[PDB]
Amino acid sequence: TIPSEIINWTILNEIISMDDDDSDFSKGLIIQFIDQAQTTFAQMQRQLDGEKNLTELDNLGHFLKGSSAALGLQRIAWVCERIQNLGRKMEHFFPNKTELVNTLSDKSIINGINIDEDDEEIKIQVDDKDENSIYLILIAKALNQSRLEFKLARIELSKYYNTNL
């Protein structure tokens, strides 16, 4: 089950302690993650729209799962594990946006935003001859969830650091 909190404070507080003798330490880590995440989402999108290679989608997901987990962005890590697992054909289902957002502990973070704003259209035609169709479409869905979870994390990190991240 997807964690309810966007940020795992147990983890992030530990990274933040190390800001005492290095002011920009944690913040530099986040800014670096923000950049890597945007590049990975674009590459995942390019796969879905181009060669549709599940192995690369696996590597991409795996990679982002690591970065995000280290920083305590647990909901992003969870969706990345879904992408990895379904690109590896080990999973066959991905929940709807409505179920996933209902898991938030503080639903107020979603009050002024449009949950589908960052959505990309699923341009995969169901092809019952391509054994990879359903997985590609499920990954397309998970990618859309990742994008929302990424936005939610930036909103939270922004209020903590007090600046647009």
mmCIF file with all atom_site columns, C-alpha atoms in Angstrom:
data_model
loop_
_atom_site.group_PDB
_atom_site.id
_atom_site.type_symbol
_atom_site.label_atom_id
_atom_site.label_alt_id
_atom_site.label_comp_id
_atom_site.label_asym_id
_atom_site.label_entity_id
_atom_site.label_seq_id
_atom_site.pdbx_PDB_ins_code
_atom_site.Cartn_x
_atom_site.Cartn_y
_atom_site.Cartn_z
_atom_site.occupancy
_atom_site.B_iso_or_equiv
_atom_site.pdbx_formal_charge
_atom_site.auth_seq_id
_atom_site.auth_comp_id
_atom_site.auth_asym_id
_atom_site.auth_atom_id
_atom_site.pdbx_PDB_model_num
ATOM 1   C CA . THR A 1 1   ? 0.000  0.000  0.000   1.00 0.00 ? 1   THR A CA 1
ATOM 2   C CA . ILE A 1 2   ? 1.143  3.521  -0.843  1.00 0.00 ? 2   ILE A CA 1
ATOM 3   C CA . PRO A 1 3   ? 2.307  5.544  2.186   1.00 0.00 ? 3   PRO A CA 1
ATOM 4   C CA . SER A 1 4   ? -0.098 8.274  3.327   1.00 0.00 ? 4   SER A CA 1
ATOM 5   C CA . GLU A 1 5   ? 2.509  10.973 3.869   1.00 0.00 ? 5   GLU A CA 1
ATOM 6   C CA . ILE A 1 6   ? 4.209  12.743 0.978   1.00 0.00 ? 6   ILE A CA 1
ATOM 7   C CA . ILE A 1 7   ? 7.359  13.254 3.036   1.00 0.00 ? 7   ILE A CA 1
ATOM 8   C CA . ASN A 1 8   ? 8.842  10.762 5.483   1.00 0.00 ? 8   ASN A CA 1
ATOM 9   C CA . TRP A 1 9   ? 10.145 13.140 8.169   1.00 0.00 ? 9   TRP A CA 1
ATOM 10  C CA . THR A 1 10  ? 12.125 10.383 9.879   1.00 0.00 ? 10  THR A CA 1
ATOM 11  C CA . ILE A 1 11  ? 14.405 10.347 6.844   1.00 0.00 ? 11  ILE A CA 1
ATOM 12  C CA . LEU A 1 12  ? 14.424 13.994 5.780   1.00 0.00 ? 12  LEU A CA 1
ATOM 13  C CA . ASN A 1 13  ? 15.043 15.268 9.292   1.00 0.00 ? 13  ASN A CA 1
ATOM 14  C CA . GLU A 1 14  ? 18.250 13.210 9.299   1.00 0.00 ? 14  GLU A CA 1
ATOM 15  C CA . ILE A 1 15  ? 19.513 14.796 6.063   1.00 0.00 ? 15  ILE A CA 1
ATOM 16  C CA . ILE A 1 16  ? 18.507 18.223 7.390   1.00 0.00 ? 16  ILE A CA 1
ATOM 17  C CA . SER A 1 17  ? 20.548 17.854 10.588  1.00 0.00 ? 17  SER A CA 1
ATOM 18  C CA . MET A 1 18  ? 23.609 17.991 8.358   1.00 0.00 ? 18  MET A CA 1
ATOM 19  C CA . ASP A 1 19  ? 22.686 21.537 7.360   1.00 0.00 ? 19  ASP A CA 1
ATOM 20  C CA . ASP A 1 20  ? 24.167 22.923 10.593  1.00 0.00 ? 20  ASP A CA 1
ATOM 21  C CA . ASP A 1 21  ? 27.694 23.130 9.164   1.00 0.00 ? 21  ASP A CA 1
ATOM 22  C CA . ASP A 1 22  ? 26.586 23.240 5.499   1.00 0.00 ? 22  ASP A CA 1
ATOM 23  C CA . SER A 1 23  ? 23.587 25.514 4.958   1.00 0.00 ? 23  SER A CA 1
ATOM 24  C CA . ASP A 1 24  ? 22.647 24.410 1.452   1.00 0.00 ? 24  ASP A CA 1
ATOM 25  C CA . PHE A 1 25  ? 23.234 20.717 2.006   1.00 0.00 ? 25  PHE A CA 1
ATOM 26  C CA . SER A 1 26  ? 19.705 19.297 2.069   1.00 0.00 ? 26  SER A CA 1
ATOM 27  C CA . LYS A 1 27  ? 18.393 21.939 -0.323  1.00 0.00 ? 27  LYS A CA 1
ATOM 28  C CA . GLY A 1 28  ? 21.121 21.165 -2.857  1.00 0.00 ? 28  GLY A CA 1
ATOM 29  C CA . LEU A 1 29  ? 20.122 17.503 -2.649  1.00 0.00 ? 29  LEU A CA 1
ATOM 30  C CA . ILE A 1 30  ? 16.465 18.327 -3.360  1.00 0.00 ? 30  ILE A CA 1
ATOM 31  C CA . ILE A 1 31  ? 17.254 20.656 -6.272  1.00 0.00 ? 31  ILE A CA 1
ATOM 32  C CA . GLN A 1 32  ? 19.407 17.886 -7.724  1.00 0.00 ? 32  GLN A CA 1
ATOM 33  C CA . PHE A 1 33  ? 16.548 15.415 -7.336  1.00 0.00 ? 33  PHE A CA 1
ATOM 34  C CA . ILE A 1 34  ? 14.056 17.796 -8.963  1.00 0.00 ? 34  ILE A CA 1
ATOM 35  C CA . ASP A 1 35  ? 16.317 18.013 -12.021 1.00 0.00 ? 35  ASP A CA 1
ATOM 36  C CA . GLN A 1 36  ? 16.902 14.251 -12.285 1.00 0.00 ? 36  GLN A CA 1
ATOM 37  C CA . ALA A 1 37  ? 13.195 13.524 -11.860 1.00 0.00 ? 37  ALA A CA 1
ATOM 38  C CA . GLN A 1 38  ? 12.146 15.818 -14.718 1.00 0.00 ? 38  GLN A CA 1
ATOM 39  C CA . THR A 1 39  ? 14.746 14.239 -17.006 1.00 0.00 ? 39  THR A CA 1
ATOM 40  C CA . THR A 1 40  ? 13.597 10.716 -16.092 1.00 0.00 ? 40  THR A CA 1
ATOM 41  C CA . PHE A 1 41  ? 9.913  11.478 -16.651 1.00 0.00 ? 41  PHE A CA 1
ATOM 42  C CA . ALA A 1 42  ? 10.765 12.808 -20.118 1.00 0.00 ? 42  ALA A CA 1
ATOM 43  C CA . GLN A 1 43  ? 12.774 9.665  -20.920 1.00 0.00 ? 43  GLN A CA 1
ATOM 44  C CA . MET A 1 44  ? 9.985  7.410  -19.669 1.00 0.00 ? 44  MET A CA 1
ATOM 45  C CA . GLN A 1 45  ? 7.528  9.399  -21.793 1.00 0.00 ? 45  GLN A CA 1
ATOM 46  C CA . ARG A 1 46  ? 9.800  9.051  -24.815 1.00 0.00 ? 46  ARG A CA 1
ATOM 47  C CA . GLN A 1 47  ? 9.896  5.266  -24.331 1.00 0.00 ? 47  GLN A CA 1
ATOM 48  C CA . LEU A 1 48  ? 6.112  5.040  -24.098 1.00 0.00 ? 48  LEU A CA 1
ATOM 49  C CA . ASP A 1 49  ? 5.777  7.165  -27.222 1.00 0.00 ? 49  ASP A CA 1
ATOM 50  C CA . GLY A 1 50  ? 8.673  5.600  -29.126 1.00 0.00 ? 50  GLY A CA 1
ATOM 51  C CA . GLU A 1 51  ? 10.328 2.216  -28.798 1.00 0.00 ? 51  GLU A CA 1
ATOM 52  C CA . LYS A 1 52  ? 8.223  0.985  -25.881 1.00 0.00 ? 52  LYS A CA 1
ATOM 53  C CA . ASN A 1 53  ? 11.056 -1.009 -24.292 1.00 0.00 ? 53  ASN A CA 1
ATOM 54  C CA . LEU A 1 54  ? 9.947  -2.390 -20.941 1.00 0.00 ? 54  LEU A CA 1
ATOM 55  C CA . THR A 1 55  ? 13.541 -3.030 -19.855 1.00 0.00 ? 55  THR A CA 1
ATOM 56  C CA . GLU A 1 56  ? 14.441 0.646  -20.087 1.00 0.00 ? 56  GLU A CA 1
ATOM 57  C CA . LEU A 1 57  ? 11.214 1.591  -18.303 1.00 0.00 ? 57  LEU A CA 1
ATOM 58  C CA . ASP A 1 58  ? 12.360 -0.863 -15.630 1.00 0.00 ? 58  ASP A CA 1
ATOM 59  C CA . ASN A 1 59  ? 15.828 0.711  -15.388 1.00 0.00 ? 59  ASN A CA 1
ATOM 60  C CA . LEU A 1 60  ? 14.332 4.212  -15.366 1.00 0.00 ? 60  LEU A CA 1
ATOM 61  C CA . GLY A 1 61  ? 11.819 3.328  -12.638 1.00 0.00 ? 61  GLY A CA 1
ATOM 62  C CA . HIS A 1 62  ? 14.426 1.474  -10.599 1.00 0.00 ? 62  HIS A CA 1
ATOM 63  C CA . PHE A 1 63  ? 16.765 4.449  -10.799 1.00 0.00 ? 63  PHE A CA 1
ATOM 64  C CA . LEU A 1 64  ? 14.164 7.007  -9.672  1.00 0.00 ? 64  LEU A CA 1
ATOM 65  C CA . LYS A 1 65  ? 12.995 4.699  -6.896  1.00 0.00 ? 65  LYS A CA 1
ATOM 66  C CA . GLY A 1 66  ? 16.480 4.943  -5.387  1.00 0.00 ? 66  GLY A CA 1
ATOM 67  C CA . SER A 1 67  ? 16.904 8.714  -5.586  1.00 0.00 ? 67  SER A CA 1
ATOM 68  C CA . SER A 1 68  ? 13.466 9.473  -4.206  1.00 0.00 ? 68  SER A CA 1
ATOM 69  C CA . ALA A 1 69  ? 13.617 6.927  -1.382  1.00 0.00 ? 69  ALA A CA 1
ATOM 70  C CA . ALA A 1 70  ? 16.917 8.319  -0.072  1.00 0.00 ? 70  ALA A CA 1
ATOM 71  C CA . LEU A 1 71  ? 15.258 11.705 0.297   1.00 0.00 ? 71  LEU A CA 1
ATOM 72  C CA . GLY A 1 72  ? 12.120 10.407 1.999   1.00 0.00 ? 72  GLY A CA 1
ATOM 73  C CA . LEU A 1 73  ? 9.833  11.064 -0.972  1.00 0.00 ? 73  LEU A CA 1
ATOM 74  C CA . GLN A 1 74  ? 8.082  7.771  -0.248  1.00 0.00 ? 74  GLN A CA 1
ATOM 75  C CA . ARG A 1 75  ? 4.978  8.174  -2.381  1.00 0.00 ? 75  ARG A CA 1
ATOM 76  C CA . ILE A 1 76  ? 7.126  8.839  -5.458  1.00 0.00 ? 76  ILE A CA 1
ATOM 77  C CA . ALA A 1 77  ? 9.295  5.848  -4.562  1.00 0.00 ? 77  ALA A CA 1
ATOM 78  C CA . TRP A 1 78  ? 6.200  3.658  -4.316  1.00 0.00 ? 78  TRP A CA 1
ATOM 79  C CA . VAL A 1 79  ? 4.887  4.605  -7.765  1.00 0.00 ? 79  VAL A CA 1
ATOM 80  C CA . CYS A 1 80  ? 8.364  4.069  -9.217  1.00 0.00 ? 80  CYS A CA 1
ATOM 81  C CA . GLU A 1 81  ? 8.379  0.535  -7.796  1.00 0.00 ? 81  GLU A CA 1
ATOM 82  C CA . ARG A 1 82  ? 5.051  -0.021 -9.533  1.00 0.00 ? 82  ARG A CA 1
ATOM 83  C CA . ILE A 1 83  ? 6.515  1.127  -12.872 1.00 0.00 ? 83  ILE A CA 1
ATOM 84  C CA . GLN A 1 84  ? 9.592  -1.061 -12.382 1.00 0.00 ? 84  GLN A CA 1
ATOM 85  C CA . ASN A 1 85  ? 7.521  -4.094 -11.362 1.00 0.00 ? 85  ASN A CA 1
ATOM 86  C CA . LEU A 1 86  ? 5.066  -3.796 -14.184 1.00 0.00 ? 86  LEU A CA 1
ATOM 87  C CA . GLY A 1 87  ? 7.810  -3.172 -16.735 1.00 0.00 ? 87  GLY A CA 1
ATOM 88  C CA . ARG A 1 88  ? 9.241  -6.449 -15.398 1.00 0.00 ? 88  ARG A CA 1
ATOM 89  C CA . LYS A 1 89  ? 5.824  -8.015 -16.012 1.00 0.00 ? 89  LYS A CA 1
ATOM 90  C CA . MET A 1 90  ? 5.564  -8.981 -12.341 1.00 0.00 ? 90  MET A CA 1
ATOM 91  C CA . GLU A 1 91  ? 2.501  -6.816 -11.753 1.00 0.00 ? 91  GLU A CA 1
ATOM 92  C CA . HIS A 1 92  ? -0.703 -6.471 -13.810 1.00 0.00 ? 92  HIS A CA 1
ATOM 93  C CA . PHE A 1 93  ? -2.730 -3.685 -12.246 1.00 0.00 ? 93  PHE A CA 1
ATOM 94  C CA . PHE A 1 94  ? -2.350 -0.043 -11.189 1.00 0.00 ? 94  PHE A CA 1
ATOM 95  C CA . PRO A 1 95  ? -4.941 1.780  -9.068  1.00 0.00 ? 95  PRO A CA 1
ATOM 96  C CA . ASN A 1 96  ? -6.884 4.809  -10.231 1.00 0.00 ? 96  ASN A CA 1
ATOM 97  C CA . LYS A 1 97  ? -5.918 8.360  -9.351  1.00 0.00 ? 97  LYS A CA 1
ATOM 98  C CA . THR A 1 98  ? -8.959 8.762  -7.102  1.00 0.00 ? 98  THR A CA 1
ATOM 99  C CA . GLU A 1 99  ? -7.990 5.796  -4.894  1.00 0.00 ? 99  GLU A CA 1
ATOM 100 C CA . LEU A 1 100 ? -4.387 6.944  -4.652  1.00 0.00 ? 100 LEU A CA 1
ATOM 101 C CA . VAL A 1 101 ? -5.204 10.508 -3.695  1.00 0.00 ? 101 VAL A CA 1
ATOM 102 C CA . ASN A 1 102 ? -7.715 9.338  -1.114  1.00 0.00 ? 102 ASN A CA 1
ATOM 103 C CA . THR A 1 103 ? -4.768 7.810  0.753   1.00 0.00 ? 103 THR A CA 1
ATOM 104 C CA . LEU A 1 104 ? -3.286 11.208 1.628   1.00 0.00 ? 104 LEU A CA 1
ATOM 105 C CA . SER A 1 105 ? -3.234 11.974 5.346   1.00 0.00 ? 105 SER A CA 1
ATOM 106 C CA . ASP A 1 106 ? -3.722 15.678 4.631   1.00 0.00 ? 106 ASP A CA 1
ATOM 107 C CA . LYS A 1 107 ? -6.081 16.050 1.674   1.00 0.00 ? 107 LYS A CA 1
ATOM 108 C CA . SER A 1 108 ? -5.837 19.813 2.015   1.00 0.00 ? 108 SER A CA 1
ATOM 109 C CA . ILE A 1 109 ? -2.699 19.822 -0.135  1.00 0.00 ? 109 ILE A CA 1
ATOM 110 C CA . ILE A 1 110 ? -4.941 18.996 -3.092  1.00 0.00 ? 110 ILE A CA 1
ATOM 111 C CA . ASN A 1 111 ? -7.434 21.778 -2.485  1.00 0.00 ? 111 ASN A CA 1
ATOM 112 C CA . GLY A 1 112 ? -6.299 24.449 -4.939  1.00 0.00 ? 112 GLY A CA 1
ATOM 113 C CA . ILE A 1 113 ? -4.766 22.190 -7.599  1.00 0.00 ? 113 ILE A CA 1
ATOM 114 C CA . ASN A 1 114 ? -5.984 20.225 -10.618 1.00 0.00 ? 114 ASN A CA 1
ATOM 115 C CA . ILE A 1 115 ? -5.022 16.584 -10.126 1.00 0.00 ? 115 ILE A CA 1
ATOM 116 C CA . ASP A 1 116 ? -4.816 16.004 -13.890 1.00 0.00 ? 116 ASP A CA 1
ATOM 117 C CA . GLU A 1 117 ? -2.986 19.139 -14.915 1.00 0.00 ? 117 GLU A CA 1
ATOM 118 C CA . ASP A 1 118 ? 0.267  17.329 -15.695 1.00 0.00 ? 118 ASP A CA 1
ATOM 119 C CA . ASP A 1 119 ? -1.360 14.374 -17.411 1.00 0.00 ? 119 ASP A CA 1
ATOM 120 C CA . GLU A 1 120 ? -0.062 13.086 -20.722 1.00 0.00 ? 120 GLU A CA 1
ATOM 121 C CA . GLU A 1 121 ? -2.514 11.417 -23.104 1.00 0.00 ? 121 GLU A CA 1
ATOM 122 C CA . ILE A 1 122 ? -2.169 7.630  -23.367 1.00 0.00 ? 122 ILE A CA 1
ATOM 123 C CA . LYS A 1 123 ? -1.262 7.149  -27.023 1.00 0.00 ? 123 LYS A CA 1
ATOM 124 C CA . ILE A 1 124 ? -0.954 3.354  -26.866 1.00 0.00 ? 124 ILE A CA 1
ATOM 125 C CA . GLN A 1 125 ? -3.541 1.569  -29.021 1.00 0.00 ? 125 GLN A CA 1
ATOM 126 C CA . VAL A 1 126 ? -4.739 -1.681 -27.447 1.00 0.00 ? 126 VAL A CA 1
ATOM 127 C CA . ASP A 1 127 ? -3.100 -4.353 -29.578 1.00 0.00 ? 127 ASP A CA 1
ATOM 128 C CA . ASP A 1 128 ? -4.048 -7.881 -28.521 1.00 0.00 ? 128 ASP A CA 1
ATOM 129 C CA . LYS A 1 129 ? -1.195 -9.122 -30.715 1.00 0.00 ? 129 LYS A CA 1
ATOM 130 C CA . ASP A 1 130 ? 1.337  -7.092 -28.726 1.00 0.00 ? 130 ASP A CA 1
ATOM 131 C CA . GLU A 1 131 ? 1.842  -8.928 -25.451 1.00 0.00 ? 131 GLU A CA 1
ATOM 132 C CA . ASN A 1 132 ? 3.237  -5.655 -24.080 1.00 0.00 ? 132 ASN A CA 1
ATOM 133 C CA . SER A 1 133 ? 0.155  -3.522 -24.602 1.00 0.00 ? 133 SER A CA 1
ATOM 134 C CA . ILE A 1 134 ? -1.507 -3.746 -21.197 1.00 0.00 ? 134 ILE A CA 1
ATOM 135 C CA . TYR A 1 135 ? 1.789  -3.168 -19.398 1.00 0.00 ? 135 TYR A CA 1
ATOM 136 C CA . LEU A 1 136 ? 2.559  -0.149 -21.551 1.00 0.00 ? 136 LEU A CA 1
ATOM 137 C CA . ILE A 1 137 ? -0.870 1.287  -20.831 1.00 0.00 ? 137 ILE A CA 1
ATOM 138 C CA . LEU A 1 138 ? -0.532 0.580  -17.107 1.00 0.00 ? 138 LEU A CA 1
ATOM 139 C CA . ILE A 1 139 ? 2.919  2.217  -17.086 1.00 0.00 ? 139 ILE A CA 1
ATOM 140 C CA . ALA A 1 140 ? 1.441  5.216  -18.901 1.00 0.00 ? 140 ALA A CA 1
ATOM 141 C CA . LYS A 1 141 ? -1.037 5.483  -16.011 1.00 0.00 ? 141 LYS A CA 1
ATOM 142 C CA . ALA A 1 142 ? 1.639  5.118  -13.338 1.00 0.00 ? 142 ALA A CA 1
ATOM 143 C CA . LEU A 1 143 ? 3.689  7.805  -15.097 1.00 0.00 ? 143 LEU A CA 1
ATOM 144 C CA . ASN A 1 144 ? 0.724  10.166 -14.791 1.00 0.00 ? 144 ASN A CA 1
ATOM 145 C CA . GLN A 1 145 ? 0.504  9.380  -11.070 1.00 0.00 ? 145 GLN A CA 1
ATOM 146 C CA . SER A 1 146 ? 4.253  9.924  -10.657 1.00 0.00 ? 146 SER A CA 1
ATOM 147 C CA . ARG A 1 147 ? 3.859  13.406 -12.118 1.00 0.00 ? 147 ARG A CA 1
ATOM 148 C CA . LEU A 1 148 ? 1.157  14.348 -9.601  1.00 0.00 ? 148 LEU A CA 1
ATOM 149 C CA . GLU A 1 149 ? 3.157  12.857 -6.722  1.00 0.00 ? 149 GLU A CA 1
ATOM 150 C CA . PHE A 1 150 ? 6.138  14.871 -7.957  1.00 0.00 ? 150 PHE A CA 1
ATOM 151 C CA . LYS A 1 151 ? 4.020  18.041 -7.885  1.00 0.00 ? 151 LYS A CA 1
ATOM 152 C CA . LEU A 1 152 ? 2.706  17.291 -4.402  1.00 0.00 ? 152 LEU A CA 1
ATOM 153 C CA . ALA A 1 153 ? 6.261  16.772 -3.152  1.00 0.00 ? 153 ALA A CA 1
ATOM 154 C CA . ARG A 1 154 ? 7.479  20.073 -4.611  1.00 0.00 ? 154 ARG A CA 1
ATOM 155 C CA . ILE A 1 155 ? 4.573  21.911 -2.974  1.00 0.00 ? 155 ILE A CA 1
ATOM 156 C CA . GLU A 1 156 ? 5.448  20.407 0.403   1.00 0.00 ? 156 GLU A CA 1
ATOM 157 C CA . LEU A 1 157 ? 9.206  20.963 0.012   1.00 0.00 ? 157 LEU A CA 1
ATOM 158 C CA . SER A 1 158 ? 8.505  24.536 -1.090  1.00 0.00 ? 158 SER A CA 1
ATOM 159 C CA . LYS A 1 159 ? 6.613  25.425 2.050   1.00 0.00 ? 159 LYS A CA 1
ATOM 160 C CA . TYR A 1 160 ? 9.341  23.965 4.241   1.00 0.00 ? 160 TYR A CA 1
ATOM 161 C CA . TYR A 1 161 ? 12.243 25.737 2.494   1.00 0.00 ? 161 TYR A CA 1
ATOM 162 C CA . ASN A 1 162 ? 10.108 28.773 1.871   1.00 0.00 ? 162 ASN A CA 1
ATOM 163 C CA . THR A 1 163 ? 10.873 29.184 -1.846  1.00 0.00 ? 163 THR A CA 1
ATOM 164 C CA . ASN A 1 164 ? 9.736  27.807 -5.215  1.00 0.00 ? 164 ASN A CA 1
ATOM 165 C CA . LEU A 1 165 ? 11.241 24.383 -5.742  1.00 0.00 ? 165 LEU A CA 1
#
